[PDB]
Design a protein around this nucleic acid. Structure first.
Ligand SMILES: *C(=O)[C@H](CCSC)NC=O
Lengths: 118, 55, 114, 123, 208
RNA sequence: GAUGUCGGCUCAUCACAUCCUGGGGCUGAAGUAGGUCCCAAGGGUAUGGCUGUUCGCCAUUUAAAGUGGUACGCGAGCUGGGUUUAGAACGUCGUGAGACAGUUCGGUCCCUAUCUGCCGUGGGCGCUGGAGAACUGAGGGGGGCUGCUCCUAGUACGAGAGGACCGGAGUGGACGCAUCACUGGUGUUCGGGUUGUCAUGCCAAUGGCACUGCCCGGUAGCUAAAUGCGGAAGAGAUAAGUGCUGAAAGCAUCUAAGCACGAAACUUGCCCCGAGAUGAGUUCUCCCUGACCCUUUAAGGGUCCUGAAGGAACGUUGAAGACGACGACGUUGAUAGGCCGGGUGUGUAAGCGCAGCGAUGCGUUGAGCUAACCGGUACUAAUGAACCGUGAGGCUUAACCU
RNA sequence: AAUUCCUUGUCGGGUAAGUUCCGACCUGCACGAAUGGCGUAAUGAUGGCCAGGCUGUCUCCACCCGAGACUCAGUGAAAUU
RNA sequence: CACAGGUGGUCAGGUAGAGAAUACCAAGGCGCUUGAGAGAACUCGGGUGAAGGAACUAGGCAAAAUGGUGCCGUAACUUC
RNA sequence: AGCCGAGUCGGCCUGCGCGGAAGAU
């Protein structure tokens, strides 16, 4: 049974899950639109949106927390200099998912995910 | 565990009576370009619900 | 649930003093022996607290007549008449289960006086 | 929660130090004994010149347990060990003359009033 | 006698002045509205049908709406039925409230239980496990033997095996009525009842 | 041209020559407690020491620890202690190779389920115009055990010692169903301590690897050791048995004609499934009211106009779930994620200042962080359409309206 | 008794309870002196028996982290008859 | 068989360490030639467990437990 | 026979029925 539970396993273990989602958050912030599998896109919202919420207040402590959760100074600088001010007056919902077709190699369903003001 | 008698072609068909595929009911037409697409999916040129999304 | 919250807030006490793990407390409870009622005292160290609204509880440990005893009290029961704080302690943790293996001088607790 | 092979301490001055449970009395297929129940025991360790010897078979009643007792409002009382008091195999009355340590109000019956009266504290 | 339809809210406790704690289940009972009366001449038995709750208009199909409009009552979330005894009468459009249980002492409650899915024999029928060591070979939770030899040469009907467990209708009998509150539409009973938070319940006076 | 043979474990089903509980007749039956026979198969019917043991003896329990059949039930379900291969030794027999229902130490247990059977869960068509709901009950399954204390009463009975029937009330053992308010377990998705080493330029601060590195606490969910409830009372027809009235047979006789009692067995009363019950049942509501042609003239084939009630498909999903199935919702919107406030857990963050030679301590500060929970809020995603389903529903006879 | 059929011989010790174990008796079915007899410190992945510590071996099983089993796309066997 | 097997000689960096043991790295070399989802019974490999502690079993089979350096101290018996 | 008026006692041979009669899907 899995009554009332939250989270996706994705046929991995916890360390691998954490590392992969770190990398993917970095890529989304860098490029502003990426292509991936639908379940992965649905999981990525819960990791990326809280970082943007954190970046609306600028302080040394918040910068250090973002560094702990990303490990990339370029990503930290973009978050605190461009994306917080852009989204200052919006209450959630910074991303958007669009379904595209199926993958040729293995028939996986696919989607684009992007920031809402690209 | 293995059979004792050889099964018949009639039985083969009876078992396969549940294997037929299903076709998509209908497609959708975009309001700006006029292309056909799967419902809730983008088109092959990059439209969705009237707006160009991908270049 | 608003309905259950309302049903629960009409049974709660409003006199409960404030205390922390590591303090010394005394609790007075009702005892019935036949047709008589009286109060009995239980004094000792607080090792655990459960903050759950009408369902709150706390646990007290003492050494009595050469034996160790523990009691788990439900905070809002009318069996409990009064709670009083006799000493204040200085600790770091929220639970103090490691005291079950200590005796005597090794079981002492420093005073806070904040 | 006392079952067969459990070892217990002794809370009276009859001479025994350690005892072992060999049967839970009552009904058929009964599993556990708690505070207030009567069990059958054998003696494993006794002091030199007491009233009982090592190897005897007797009855006893349980007075403290590590699992504890519940109360009508939901409270608990727990102790650090398991202890009992020795009884006579025919009359079911105490053998000793003194009681050591606290006991509980579960014993307040017409059968164990001597224990209640001799105890140093009833919780 | 007739009963009522309600909804499971949750579980709590009541403290008494002597220092006793009574665990309780809280049931919300709004007004039940009569939709149809069935008699001996036209149907062959004696009963009433009731509704309760509310439902959005664009989810009500035309057949259902016509049935409601015949009785002259607002739409609810379902329809239920109760059998009548000698000397009991009701009329269409009438309202029945939780003050019906003012003097009843014990009730029976009926609901749908939580669903566990596909289950093994250890959890479904309380079978005993075999040895975890001493040379056991891949047979730790398996069922064991299921029959005899050439006589009879088959498996008997009704054998206990693994399968779906839960998600069915259950009744629990003879629960004390602890409180009846009519200004807030509440009924408090002692003990646990089947179902999950938010499910439907049927409450009747006790048969034994 | 192969039907695996003792004992144990798991899981069972039937008989009655009845171990316990239920109902009776006789007693060399005063009471308590016993002996013997008749009726009755609903439910129930031990844990250990020794030995490969089935048995058996012994210790301590129980209302009681029944007797037999089912390939001496059960190895394509498990074990391998014993019997029954090849090594080695003792006693005994033989000149010897060797041998002994005599001992002793060691010694490979294979198979992915086609057909029947059994436990669960779907697709098709039928039930006579189509559709959405609520039911009746032919039939089937589950359940059915019992201890101790108190009153009646120290009464009936008895020289005394002892000590009841009948009828009431309470508290337990074993078993079954449900649930998470309380007591607790788990909680590699929440917080903290700390050993070795590598990196982010360096101080300070952080992250990766070593079984989650090793540990200390713990939210939601699941859950027992936790806490609610159950076995009935009533009714019908009876078994062994006990009777009323009454002849055949002027008396007597429970029976031949008539009438009355009588048990956990039978049929109901309690709980669950149930119209594929092809004998395919009933009740309430909703929808469809156009023109032509041909022919072998009929429950006939075709053309134009028309497309209802409702359903299915797709999307956001659930305390529902292997997949199907079942439930909620789709801008006239709280279905999921995010966002705002709270609660819960851990336990006084970073930066700065002060004291001290320093490790560290104190203030700002019950601080910072906080998953699955509670109450709210259209920021993001749930698109207009298209698809399936039709156009008033056969024949004969009867009774009523015209 | 690595030897004893009768046999779980009889007596003592250890356990609440010991056909195995340890010490003795002698009625040796069928021990016995280089196909050696009786003893012996140290050594042994050797046979038998008892204790302390320790535990999911067990009363009686509960939850969790991973790999298959289940669903979609590509390839694609076997014994038997 | 593009097979979890077998096959002699030489070279020997850093931190901690008795060490060519073990952990983390350098130079250098690799992610093992089917994938994507879901989060049932049962099987495989592991982590934790209230109260009891061999009651299991032919048998403590398997698991759990002990574990370093310096110093104090150590019995019957003996071929010393 | 029981407490007055036509039958009543018990042996023999033979036809057909009755008890003696408990088992495992
Ligand atoms: C007799 O000794 C036994 C009979 C075998 S019958 C299948 N064989 C032992 O090897």
């Amino acid at each position: 049974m899995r009554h009332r539970k939250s989270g996706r396993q994705l046929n991995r273990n916890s360390s691998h899950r954490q590392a992969m989602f770190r990398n993917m958050a970095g890529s989304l912030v860098r490029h502003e639109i990426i292509k991936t599998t639908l379940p992965k896109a649905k999981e990525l919202r819960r990791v990326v949106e809280p970082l943007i919420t954190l970046a609306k207040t600028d302080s040394v402590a918040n910068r250090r927390l973002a560094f702990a959760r990303t490990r990339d100074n370029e990503i930290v600088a973009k978050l605190f200099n461009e994306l917080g001010p852009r989204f200052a007056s919006r209450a959630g919902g910074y991303t958007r998912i669009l379904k595209c077709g199926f993958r040729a190699g293995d028939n996986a369903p696919m989607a684009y995910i992007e920031l809402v003001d690209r | 565990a293995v059979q004792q008698n050889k099964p018949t072609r009639s039985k083969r068909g009876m078992r396969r009576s549940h294997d037929a595929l299903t076709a998509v009911t209908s497609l959708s037409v975009d309001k700006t370009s006029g292309e056909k697409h799967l419902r809730h999916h983008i088109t092959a040129d990059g439209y969705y619900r009237g707006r160009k999304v991908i270049a | 649930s608003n309905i259950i919250k309302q049903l629960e807030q009409e049974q709660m006490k409003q006199d409960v003093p404030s205390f922390r793990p590591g303090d010394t407390v005394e609790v007075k409870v009702w005892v019935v022996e036949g047709s008589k009622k009286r109060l009995q005292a239980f004094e000792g160290v607080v090792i655990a607290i459960r903050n759950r609204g009408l369902h709150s509880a706390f646990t007290v440990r003492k050494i009595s007549n050469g034996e160790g005893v523990e009691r788990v009290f439900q905070t809002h029961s009318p069996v409990v008449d009064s709670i009083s704080v006799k000493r204040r302690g200085a600790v770091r943790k929220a639970k103090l289960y490691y005291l079950r293996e200590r005796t005597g001088k090794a079981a002492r607790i420093k005073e806070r006086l904040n | 929660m006392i079952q067969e092979q459990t070892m217990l301490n002794v809370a009276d001055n009859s001479g025994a130090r350690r005892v072992m449970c060999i049967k839970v009395l009552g009904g058929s297929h009964r599993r556990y004994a708690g505070v207030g129940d009567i069990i059958k025991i054998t003696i494993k360790e006794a002091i030199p010149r007491g009233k009982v010897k090592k190897g005897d078979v007797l009855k006893a009643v349980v007075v403290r347990t590590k699992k504890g007792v519940r109360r009508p409002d939901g409270s608990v009382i727990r102790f650090d060990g398991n202890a009992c008091v020795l009884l006579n195999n025919n009359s079911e009355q105490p053998i000793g003359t003194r009681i050591f340590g606290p006991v509980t109000r579960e014993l307040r019956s017409e059968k164990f009033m001597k224990i209640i009266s001799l105890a140093p504290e009833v919780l | 006698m007739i009963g009522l339809v309600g909804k499971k809210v949750g579980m709590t406790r009541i403290f008494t002045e002597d220092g006793v704690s009574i665990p309780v289940t809280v049931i919300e009972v709004e007004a039940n509205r009569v939709t149809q009366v069935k008699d001996l001449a036209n149907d062959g038995y004696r009963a009433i049908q009731v509704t309760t709750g509310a439902k959005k208009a664009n989810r009500v199909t035309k057949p259902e709406a016509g049935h409601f409009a015949k009785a002259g009552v607002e739409a609810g979330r379902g329809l239920w039925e109760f059998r009548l005894a000698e000397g009991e009468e009701f009329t269409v459009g009438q309202s029945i409230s939780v003050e019906l249980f003012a003097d009843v002492k014990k009730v029976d409650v009926t609901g749908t239980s939580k669903g566990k899915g596909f289950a093994g024999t250890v959890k479904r029928w309380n079978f005993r496990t075999q040895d975890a060591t001493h040379g056991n070979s891949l047979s730790h939770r398996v069922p064991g033997s299921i029959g005899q030899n050439q006589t009879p040469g088959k498996v008997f009907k009704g054998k206990k095996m693994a399968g779906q467990m839960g998600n069915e209708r259950v009744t629990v009998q003879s629960l004390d009525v602890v409180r009846v509150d009519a200004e807030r539409n509440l009924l408090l009973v002692k003990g646990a009842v089947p179902g999950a938070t938010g499910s439907d319940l049927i409450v009747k006076p006790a048969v034994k």
